[PDB]
Amino acid sequence: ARLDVASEFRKKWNKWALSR
C-alpha cells in the first residue's frame, strides 16, 4: 500500500504551500 506514505507526503508538502 502507498496510501499511508502518499498521504503523509501531502502533509509535509502542505507546509510548503502555507509557508510559500
Swiss-Prot record:
Protein name, please? Proadrenomedullin N-20 terminal peptide
Q: Which residues of the full protein are shown?
A: 22 to 41 of 185
Q: Which residues carry this modification: Arginine amide?
A: 20
The organism's taxonomic lineage, starting at the top: Eukaryota, Metazoa, Chordata, Craniata, Vertebrata
What gene does this protein come from? ADM
Superkingdom of this protein's organism: Eukaryota
